Paper text:
We determined the structures for the inactive constructs PgDPP1122-720 S655A, PeDPP1122-717 S652A and its complexes with the dipeptides Arg-Asp and Arg-Glu, as well as the substrate Leu-Asp-Val-Trp, at 2.4, 2.85, 2.2, 2.1 and 2.6 Å resolution, referred to as PgDPP11, PeDPP11, PeDPP11:RD, PeDPP11:RE and PeDPP11:LDVWs, respectively. PeDPP11 and PgDPP11 superposition yielded a root mean square deviation (r.m.s.d.) of 1.4 Å for 629 out of 685 superimposed Cα-atoms. The binding of peptides to PgDPP11 induces the dimerization of its monomeric population, masking the real thermodynamic contributions involved in the binding process. In this way, we focused our thermodynamic analysis solely on PeDPP11. Indeed, P. gingivalis dpp11-knock-out strain shows growth impairment, suggesting its critical role in the bacterium energy metabolism.
Here, we show that dipeptidyl peptidase 11 (DPP11), a central metabolic enzyme in these bacteria, undergoes a conformational change upon peptide binding to distinguish substrates from end products. As previously reported, the overall fold of DPP11 comprises a bilobal architecture. The upper helical domain dictates the specificity of the enzyme and caps the catalytic domain, which has a typical chymotrypsin double β-barrel fold. The active site of DPP11 lays in a wide cleft running through the middle of the protein between the catalytic and helical domains, which contributes to the formation of the substrate binding subsites.
Residue numbers in the entry:
A (entry chain A): 21 to 720
B (entry chain B): 23 to 720
The structure:
């Protein structure tokens, strides 16, 4: 009944506990190392999402935001699938995609002993090859064979490290690249929440999209070709219309990206007081200035809408993270965890575990000021100031303009012009960039002393007498990239000396020199920490056991289980476990592009045309939440019944659960799942694509 | 659900016990004796209060006693921010222009008033609602020398049910009410602006006073010979607390409701009153917000003004939400349609005609009422220099006339009003930008022929440029800046003052303001007279039990249950909030959500004493299904035994439309827990003498 991201190898140790939570299905029907199981119906979608096979003709279900770029690619102004939706009424009408892939995890094997054996060919006791993917791939190819490439078309092999390098798994992957768009709801449904309901529970978003795997006649992976035939999968999920109740058993298979549950207390402090605090501070200034300019000018708004929203993402994540640190007591539990290992190690008579923790603590404290300057210049200038990424003449661009007689002279200018036009594009505003720069630079100059500044920015004190505005003004005034006309003047009569002394080029070069210097000075602190973490985790595994703890996520297939349950976000407030179509209508706002409601959906609601998709009360469910443990990567993970029947599609996590990447939050962290009944409702009543329903296997 | 008269207690008493009341009727209200009613007061003519001890202790809201706490707040031993606690009865601070009113007696005088009324000539006379006429009727029935023969007592007659019911009130008024105790503003106004009209709420909204009188308990103005009043009745304070579905009841003075509005009056309310208020204030607040964020002292200068505007703005939003989602218009349409069908089968068309008369009057005044709200919200309340100083008749004649140093008298009188106008919280540049935005909207909605005479210069003298018009006003004007005033003050000439673009503006927007008012008021009487027939029809058709008369600042009682509600899909607000919520909302950088140091220490140490509930969590506030409105602030909340379990101080925004129609699934009275009040007095105020003097039932 533990909450984590468990390896498929751990199903045996957890199976009895899962039955106690309500699992009524048989273990090897879920995962079988030596046979067909439900795992075979789960896929890694396009490298970053999760998907699931739903029919015996290769039908694949994933999120709408996962298939977003592909729907957009097949969308034109006249025939807009991104806003109207797409529904191929026959298999021939399904749209092929380029740069798309789907990956089955066919076989998983423990190769810890094999890897460790190959590692005792020691060159250096503190070599980092045990975490090197390049090195592990060589070990992977060695065990698989010389040209496993040709002997098994469509199959590839990979070795990954777990538990800081104390466990190694080999994966046999099956990769299909002919995956075509089948079905998609309108943006008003799949993206109903948009950005204001992002990371928010309750939620009413029909976040899904439908695809199909194609292959050759035998079902072997093949690139796009009109002679390809829909894949007949080894296994596919059954659809359940039985729905969910409060406290119902729920489980999830998917590919969680990254977690850091084995952070020391000092690493939590570092994450809070340096990484998050600087990011929050610098971005609040940047977004503040940016917001002000967007409201005052509707044209600035359409240009900086994406940049603003993008900056907000990691900003909100850092806010939620620090909230978890302060109120959930994440630092204290890590501190209790390592203290418990130290006390255990002392009793055992092995001091190496305490020594490893001390090694980490001392290293974190040592690099604090360097890491501070790094994040300050990364958040402040590198990310915060647009003209920091202004064009910088390469070495061979300089030589070609300098004493170089050939008129490749001109070719170098064309390359520079291209980079300038991308910098000063249709969304770029110098006036807005200037105001942002002045605010960001003022804060940066406040926090960073003269001796540690990049070698420009010193001129604010030496040349501009502390006037940041005049410093920024002088840059755009006398530069080549200051405006279109100033660049054309340079392009007409180009000289290496004019670029060498260019105020903006000097800035961009100076801030990037310092950026790389701090980076090179911080990097040798990583290896001693990693080696100590290997010892640390090894001790934790030996002490607490290998059953009631799980390795950090690493884009590897994991399973998680829990119950359908709401939670209390704050005093006197409780969020329930299931949202309804009623909630969609309550949020309807014609003037807001986010909360626009599709006409067909509202008609279905008002006519109560829900068929067999509604519950007993007669209400139409939209989404529900569960106590399962998920993170980025579980984007489109299948949510299963007690009998392994598909009951929903995971698509998000509430913002309170962002601390879950460090420590699972039982009373606050919730997986946000769209009800499969609502999915089938959209397909039936909105899409009208009946062929997809007949294709699926639906249980009572 | 009902704001019932005290006379209707007999009818409801059965239902009240059916829903949980276990208290004898005549102890609640006794028409011919002492009851719990005698412990309820009208506080300072606006709020409600209650007598808490046998030495005249009075509890009310913090926002009710706000003016009085500040009035005693010096330069820097400020009670408004730190709190106030008199450690003995001798340093309890008297307040002038304060009052406390007991409702000593209530009697029905309907037939008396009506037969007096069937003695007036004009059938359309409005004397049946005239306070002057009704008072003269009251003086007649009470006797000529009533006040002289009854010390401290006065008499008053009020109209109910649109003039179909008249009650006579005998009032005992005390004017010596001293300030006793008050929590810090951080507690008394914790919700402040962000959480106003909002549940859950974590505001300890209370303040403490005491009634003083002469040697015999009779009313008397402020005197140091005055002795604390020994009341004939005061509330017992319960520490048993509340649970979900617990019976709860309230006595107080609800100000105004509009239960008997027609469908058209609802449409008028939304499309004109609320929509214009919402639209205009959104524009004004938007400009203010931009300027406040840009300059930190502008933020200081316009913090209060911005907040004040948001108050009715938020209420308007809540009201229109109810109209759109709860279908208030449809319910009124059905209500009047029933009377029409009922009146038809009886051969009585007078009810249908009354409804049409109301609709016709609303229709005809539609354009005029739109212009009124447009200029009131847009300019009178929307633009600051609209209230710039205007030269009166006696200062015009002085500067002009040329015959004294009374000329210079007039100047300093004008200078005084200008300084008050252009004070420390006033910014000419901010007022400039606000004006341009407001006038831009106003000139769009109001045609040239209906403009204030000065505003039509934006087209005539200027090229439609509102900015240039506003710029020209602040330039050239005597009141445009301090330097431009002193120049006038040195060389005062009336022909210049009479041609001032700022004076012309302010005068022409106000005479238009008054012109519309005087033109709209004759429309009130037909609706009123028709409303009398309408309500009389509704009463005769359905009865005297499930329809309450509109609130009119008279003593009412309402009853319900301690229970939360679901504001939206998959969301539920519980019935009771706790001290945990205060800490969850804490933000030291925001003055609204600043948690008091002592209060914070109390929470950390779990030092709750007997004031905690059976779980170990400290209660702060709860909500009930009672039916309250503006005026019910500071009202006593009673349990099943008539014991005080808290003070009402607000109402959730989802229940704003309750003045038109009670919403059982949304409308809730927001009530501070009496346990939390005693906690603040004890572990924060350190005023134990207040605890001991009260009668606390453990």
């Amino acid at each position: 009944m533990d909450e984590g991201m468990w390896l498929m190898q751990q199903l045996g140790r957890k199976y009895a506990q899962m039955k106690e939570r309500g699992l009524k299905m048989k273990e090897y029907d879920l995962y079988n190392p030596n046979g067909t199981s439900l795992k075979d119906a789960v896929v890694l979608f396009d490298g970053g999402c999760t998907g699931e096979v739903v029919s015996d003709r290769g039908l694949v279900l994933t999120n709408h935001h996962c298939g977003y770029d592909m729907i957009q690619a097949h969308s034109t102004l006249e025939h807009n699938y991104l806003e109207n939706g797409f529904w191929a009424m026959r298999e021939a009408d399904e749209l092929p995609n380029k740069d798309i892939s789907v990956v089955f995890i066919d076989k998983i094997e423990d190769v810890t002993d094999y890897v460790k054996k190959e590692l005792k060919a020691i060159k250096d006791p503190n070599s980092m090859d045990y975490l090197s993917p390049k090195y592990l791939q060589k070990l992977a190819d060695k065990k698989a064979g010389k040209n496993f490439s040709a002997k098994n078309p469509g199959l590839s092999v990979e070795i990954k490290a777990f538990y800081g390098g104390n466990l190694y798994l080999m994966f046999t992957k099956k990769t299909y690249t002919d995956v075509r768009l089948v079905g998609a709801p309108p943006s008003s449904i799949g993206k109903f929440g948009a950005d204001t309901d992002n990371w928010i529970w309750p939620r009413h978003t029909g976040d899904f999209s439908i695809f199909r795997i194609y292959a050759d006649k035998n079902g072997n992976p093949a690139p796009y070709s009109e002679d390809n035939v829909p894949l007949k999968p080894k296994r596919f999920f059954n659809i359940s219309l039985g729905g969910v109740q409060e406290n119902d058993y729920a489980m999830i298979m998917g590919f969680p990206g990254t977690t850091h549950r084995y952070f020391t207390a000092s690493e939590v402090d570092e994450w809070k007081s340096i990484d998050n605090d600087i990011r929050i501070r610098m971005r609040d200034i940047r977004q503040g200035v940016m917001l002000r300019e967007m409201l005052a000018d509707p044209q600035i708004k359409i240009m900086y809408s994406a940049k603003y929203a993008a900056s907000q993402n990691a900003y909100k994540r850092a806010i939620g993270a620090n909230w978890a640190i302060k109120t959930r007591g994440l630092r204290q539990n890590k501190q209790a965890m390592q203290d418990r290992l130290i006390a255990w190690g002392a009793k055992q008579g092995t001091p190496r575990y305490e020594e490893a923790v001390h090694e980490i603590d001392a290293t974190v404290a040592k690099r604090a000021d360097l890491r501070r300057r790094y994040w300050m210049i990364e958040e402040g200038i590198i990310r915060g100031i647009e003209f920091a990424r202004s064009p910088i003449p390469t070495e061979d661009e300089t030589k070609a303009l300098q004493g170089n007689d050939a008129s490749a002279r001109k070719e170098a200018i064309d390359k520079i012009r291209t980079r300038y036009s991308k910098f000063a594009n249709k969304d770029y505003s110098a006036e807005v960039d200037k105001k942002v720069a002045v605010a960001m630079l003022t804060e940066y100059l406040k926090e960073i002393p003269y001796e540690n500044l990049p070698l420009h920015l010193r001129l604010v004190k030496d040349r501009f007498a502390g006037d940041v505005q005049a410093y920024v003004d002088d840059i755009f005034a006398r530069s080549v990239f200051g405006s279109e006309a100033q660049f054309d003047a340079f392009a007409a009569v180009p000289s290496v000396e004019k670029l060498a002394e260019d105020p903006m080029v000097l800035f961009a070069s100076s801030v990037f020199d310092e950026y790389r210097k701090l980076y090179n000075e911080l990097r040798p602190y990583d290896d001693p920490i990693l080696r100590a973490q290997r010892t640390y985790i090894a001790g934790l595994l030996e002490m607490d056991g290998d059953q009631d703890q799980f390795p950090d996520a690493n884009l590897t297939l994991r399973f998680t289980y829990g119950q359908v349950k709401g939670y209390s976000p704050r005093d006197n407030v409780y969020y329930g476990h299931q949202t309804t179509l009623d909630g969609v209508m309550e949020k309807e706002d014609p003037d807001n592009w986010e909360f626009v409601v599709d006409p067909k959906l509202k008609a279905v609601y008002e006519r109560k045309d829900f068929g067999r998709y509604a519950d007993r009360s007669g209400r139409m469910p939209v989404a529900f939440c569960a106590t399962t443990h998920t993170t980025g990567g579980n984007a489109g993970s299948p949510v299963m019944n007690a009998n392994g029947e598909l009951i929903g599609l995971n698509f998000d996590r509430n913002w309170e659960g962002v601390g879950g990447d460090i420590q699972y939050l039982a009373d606050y962290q919730r997986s946000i799942i769209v009800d499969i009944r609502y999915v089938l409702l959209v397909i039936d009543k909105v899409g009208g694509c009946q062929r997809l329903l007949d294709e699926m296997n639906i249980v009572p």
